[PDB]
Amino acid sequence: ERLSGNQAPSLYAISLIVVFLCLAALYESWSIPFSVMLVVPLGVIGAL
Amino acid sequence: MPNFFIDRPIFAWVIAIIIMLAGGLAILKLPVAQYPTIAPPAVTISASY
Amino acid sequence: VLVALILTPALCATMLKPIAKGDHGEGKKGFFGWFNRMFEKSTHHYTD
Amino acid sequence: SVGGILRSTGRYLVLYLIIVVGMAYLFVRLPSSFLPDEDQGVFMTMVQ
Numbered sequence: 001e002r003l004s005g006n007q008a009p010s011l012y013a014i015s016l017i018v019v020f021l022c023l024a025a026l027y028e029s030w031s032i033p034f035s036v037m038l039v040v041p042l043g044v045i046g047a048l
Numbered sequence: 049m050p051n052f053f054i055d056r057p058i059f060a061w062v063i064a065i066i067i068m069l070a071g072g073l074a075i076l077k078l079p080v081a082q083y084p085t086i087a088p089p090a091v092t093i094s095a096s097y
Numbered sequence: 098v099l100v101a102l103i104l105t106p107a108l109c110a111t112m113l114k115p116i117a118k119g120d121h122g123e124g125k126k127g128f129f130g131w132f133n134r135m136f137e138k139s140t141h142h143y144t145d
Numbered sequence: 146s147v148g149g150i151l152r153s154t155g156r157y158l159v160l161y162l163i164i165v166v167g168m169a170y171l172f173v174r175l176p177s178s179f180l181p182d183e184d185q186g187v188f189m190t191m192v193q
């Protein structure tokens with residue numbers, strides 16, 4: 001428990017960043033990806 | 049490939065940014081030293097009479 | 098070589114300012130104006 | 146039904162922010178463990 005442990009929040013941050021970048025390449029837009037990225041909390045709410 | 053990314057400049061940026069991000073995260077975990085293991089390994093047998 | 102085939106061409110097509118036909122920066126003001134005239138002159142020396 | 150939602154637009158953006166705050170609350174509220182205790186068809190009794 002002491003040395004290392006809680007590294008999940010950083011990996012979730014990296015996950016969403018890389019997904020946004022990959023979406024940006026797919027659509028060739030910095031803005032359009034947000035239309036997909038805004039759906040994430042609509043899924044997480046159900047799990048919780 | 050050049051003509052592909054000439055029309056797709058955001059794609060070109062994405063590839064570069066992902067490479068840079070991967071590199072940034074690597075620097076945090078990468079160990080630091082003067083040299084790597086350049087010295088050949090040794091084994092010593094110690095006995096007493 | 099990957100950066101030069103992917104990123105560099107994309108930036109050249111979007112970021113580079115148009116250069117007029119015949120312009121070699123010989124008409125620039127200050128140091129860069131002097132250096133361009135020096136180099137253009139040095140190129141003629143070399144080719145000859 | 147979707148046709149009527151797009152006429153409103155701004156209304157459902159406020160509902161979205163409540164879901165994000167609702168999601169944020171449940172996540173903070175939810176206790177955290179590693180792996181649940183499983184019934185393995187066996188257990189031990191300590192006598193001291």
Ligand SMILES: CCCCCCCCCC[N+](C)(C)[O-]
Binds near residue numbers: 061065107108111112
């Ligand atoms: C470190 C990431 C910064 C990327 C910003 C790129 C957008 C600026 C415009 C450049 N352009 C896309 C026209 O080549």
Ligand SMILES: CCCCCCCCCC
Binds near residue numbers: 069
């Ligand atoms: C760490 C990831 C940064 C993402 C870059 C976004 C590009 C800006 C668009 C103008």
Ligand SMILES: CCCCCCCC
Binds near residue numbers: 140142
């Ligand atoms: C860039 C080199 C210029 C000098 C050429 C030599 C002429 C004698």
